Design a protein around this ligand. Structure first.
Ligand SMILES: *[C@@H]1O[C@H](CO)[C@@H](O[C@@H]2O[C@H](CO)[C@@H](O)[C@H](O)[C@H]2NC(C)=O)[C@H](O)[C@H]1NC(C)=O
Ligand SMILES: *[C@@H]1O[C@H](CO)[C@@H](O[C@@H]2O[C@H](CO)[C@@H](O)[C@H](O)[C@H]2NC(C)=O)[C@H](O)[C@H]1NC(C)=O
Ligand SMILES: *[C@@H]1O[C@H](CO)[C@@H](O[C@@H]2O[C@H](CO)[C@@H](O)[C@H](O)[C@H]2NC(C)=O)[C@H](O)[C@H]1NC(C)=O
Ligand SMILES: *[C@@H]1O[C@H](CO)[C@@H](O[C@@H]2O[C@H](CO)[C@@H](O)[C@H](O)[C@H]2NC(C)=O)[C@H](O)[C@H]1NC(C)=O
Ligand SMILES: *[C@@H]1O[C@H](CO)[C@@H](O[C@@H]2O[C@H](CO)[C@@H](O)[C@H](O)[C@H]2NC(C)=O)[C@H](O)[C@H]1NC(C)=O
Ligand SMILES: *[C@@H]1O[C@H](CO)[C@@H](O[C@@H]2O[C@H](CO)[C@@H](O)[C@H](O)[C@H]2NC(C)=O)[C@H](O)[C@H]1NC(C)=O
Ligand SMILES: *[C@@H]1O[C@H](CO)[C@@H](O)[C@H](O)[C@H]1NC(C)=O
Ligand SMILES: *[C@@H]1O[C@H](CO)[C@@H](O)[C@H](O)[C@H]1NC(C)=O
Ligand SMILES: *[C@@H]1O[C@H](CO)[C@@H](O)[C@H](O)[C@H]1NC(C)=O
Ligand SMILES: *[C@@H]1O[C@H](CO)[C@@H](O)[C@H](O)[C@H]1NC(C)=O
Lengths: 49, 167, 236
């Protein structure tokens, strides 16, 4: 209060000093299901090349 | 001349060469995505299917049509999303904020004060001080609620105000 | 079965009125009980829609296609520029089990018909790039909107139980998004596909233009009404 008002003595009243806000805790990543794999096993595990 | 006894140099080796092309046509193959888990009722940030933003996620009763992926309200602000896996409607609320004010009787009289957080629920203040009061104007810390009534010394709001007797 | 059937059928193409048909959801956003103004490609209200009762027609920038069909004689669509093996071409057919989509360089017959005895329309098929199979799209009214932009081919659709006898009704109904294709192509002209047994099809074609519309979203996020923004001073 003294710093914002720039004085060593403060008169009776109510004064607005600063702002308040909540901070985020963690992060969340969401994405659709993993499906429709690229066929690589059949080629790499193929008997005949 | 592949034979079982031919040494390392003559062994039959199967070789596959993979080449990647990224022509001007839209991409069709990509790697995994590695989605994380879900939390609720906490101020967190998120990137739902590439849509980023912070806030708190709650359960919502809005009913999407089967083809929307999210929703926004007037003035173009996103309000709801649909999780790509469970396919349910979640609601987004910005994390709380406000201003702080100090009530003092004057340095001439004393030097103890009370604090008011404007428009903030009395659940996430932090820090303890004294008993904490919840008013229509916000949350107040450092004053005692009484049942009497007097004139108004230091107006606080919503029909209540404070004075020094303690505060 | 590359056979010819007719040479000069009913030539004069009729004209009729569009009224207030051809509205589709322009995005995947949910809105509830709100008015929203958007600028995009639409079919102007009370426009002149061409009635056919079957040549190659221009695509321009987008196409609205309508059919008061029964027993689904129409089968599919063909898109391209040169309509031969020298350039990309897109083919869509709908048989009794699964709608089929292909992107190849065919040699379509000059009178490509399916008939029953998935060939008889193209004399060749090579260098195929994209394939797709899904559930088939189809006294019924079938409305479709075809758009192509940013290497993406968008298809919107709607089916309606129609009781009127001759032409489009005086009603309102939005079109849901159906399919998107991430394939680059330069469609400029197209053609309709019919499968007639060896022994005269009525449909409507309209074109899209860029303009602004006002849309009303009800509580459940469904478009219930719209206003064209250049029809008359009251609309402005
Ligand atoms: C993504 O995969 C998960 C894992 O299987 C699916 O979750 C299961 O879905 C079935 C189908 O209804 C339920 O019977 C199970 O109880 C679910 N298990 C859970 C939630 O742990 C999920 O449905 C899939 N999402 C899709 C395919 O969109
Ligand atoms: C501060 O938050 C609490 C917690 O949500 C609110 O208490 C809820 O109030 C609603 C409606 O009054 C009830 O349906 C919930 O059951 C309450 N939950 C709990 C845990 O008490 C409280 O109302 C909020 N403060 C203000 C001033 O609204
Ligand atoms: C309809 O078109 C499909 C397009 O592939 C034809 O092909 C069969 O479709 C069924 C549907 O699942 C598959 O089980 C078969 O394996 C497909 N055949 C082949 C050779 O792959 C289908 O035959 C067509 N049906 C009719 C009645 O025309
Ligand atoms: C088969 O079709 C593909 C695309 O559908 C053609 O790919 C071309 O590839 C070259 C170099 O990779 C590019 O410069 C061209 O722009 C591509 N063309 C198109 C239309 O995308 C491929 O040339 C075709 N092959 C044959 C034999 O026709
Ligand atoms: C449609 O045809 C045009 C040619 O008129 C293609 O535009 C060319 O695109 C390549 C790749 O970016 C450029 O290097 C050329 O300079 C472009 N030519 C012109 C005349 O602009 C366009 O790519 C074709 N559409 C698709 C989807 O391939
Ligand atoms: C919009 O959504 C509401 C909420 O679901 C619909 O109201 C329901 O309609 C069904 C069908 O008649 C009734 O069986 C339910 O009882 C209704 N719910 C309630 C709470 O009354 C409404 O029909 C939908 N459409 C419109 C145009 O409002
Ligand atoms: C091939 O099969 C073996 C069998 O154990 C497995 O260990 C290996 O991962 C497979 N590789 C591919 C590419 O599928
Ligand atoms: C408070 O103010 C009174 C006059 O109003 C003065 O006499 C007194 O000295 C002051 N006390 C302080 C400044 O501590
Ligand atoms: C009086 O004040 C006390 C303490 O603030 C409070 O608990 C009580 O509800 C008030 N009213 C009565 C009738 O006691
Ligand atoms: C379309 O234009 C023709 C003249 O070319 C006109 O006779 C017909 O009434 C018009 N149809 C409309 C505006 O629906």
């Amino acid at each position: 209060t003294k710093c914002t008002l720039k004085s060593f003595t403060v008169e009776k009243g109510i004064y607005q000093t600063s702002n308040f806000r909540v901070q985020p805790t963690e992060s969340i990543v969401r994405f659709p299901n993993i499906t429709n794999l690229c066929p690589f096993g059949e080629v790499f595990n193929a008997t005949r090349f | 001349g592949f034979q079982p006894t031919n040494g390392v140099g003559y062994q039959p080796y199967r070789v596959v060469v993979l080449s990647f092309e990224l022509l001007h046509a839209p991409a069709t193959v990509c790697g995994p995505k590695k989605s994380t888990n879900l939390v609720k009722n906490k101020c967190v940030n998120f990137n739902f299917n590439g849509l980023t933003g912070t806030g708190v996620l709650t359960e919502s009763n809005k009913k999407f049509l089967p083809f929307q992926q999210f929703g926004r309200d007037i003035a173009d602000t996103t309000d709801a999303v649909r999780d790509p896996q469970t396919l349910e409607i979640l609601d987004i609320t910005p994390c709380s904020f406000g201003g702080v004010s100090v009530i003092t009787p004057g340095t001439n009289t004393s030097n103890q004060v009370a604090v008011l957080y404007q428009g903030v629920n009395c659940t996430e203040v932090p820090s303890t001080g004294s008993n904490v009061f919840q008013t229509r104007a916000g949350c107040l810390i450092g004053a005692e609620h009484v049942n009497n009534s007097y004139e108004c010394d230091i107006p606080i709001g919503a029909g209540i105000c404070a004075s020094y007797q303690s505060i | 079965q590359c056979v010819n059937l007719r040479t000069r059928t009913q030539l004069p193409p009729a004209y009729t009125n569009s009224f207030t048909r051809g509205v589709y959801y322009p995005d995947k956003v949910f809105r509830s009980s709100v008015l929203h103004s958007t600028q995009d490609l639409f079919l102007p209200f009370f426009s002149n829609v061409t009635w056919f009762h079957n040549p190659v027609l221009p695509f321009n920038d987008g196409v609205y296609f309508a059919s008061t069909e029964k027993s689904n004689i129409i089968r599919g669509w063909i898109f391209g520029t040169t309509l031969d093996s020298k350039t990309q071409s897109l083919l869509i057919v709908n048989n009794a089990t699964n709608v089929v989509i292909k992107v190849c360089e065919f040699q379509f017959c000059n009178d490509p018909f399916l008939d029953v005895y998935e060939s008889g329309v193209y004399s060749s098929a090579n260098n195929c790039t994209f394939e797709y199979v899904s559930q088939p799209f189809l006294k019924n009214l079938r409305e479709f909107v075809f758009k192509n932009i940013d290497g993406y081919f968008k298809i919107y659709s709607k089916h309606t139980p129609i009781n009127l006898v001759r032409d489009l009704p005086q009603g309102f109904s939005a079109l849901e998004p159906l399919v998107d294709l991430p394939i680059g192509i330069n469609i400029t002209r197209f053609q309709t596909l019919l499968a007639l047994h060896r022994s005269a099809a009525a449909y409507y074609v309209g074109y899209l233009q860029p303009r602004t519309f006002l849309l009303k979203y009800n509580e459940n996020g469904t478009i219930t009404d719209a206003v064209d923004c250049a029809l008359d001073p009251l609309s402005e």
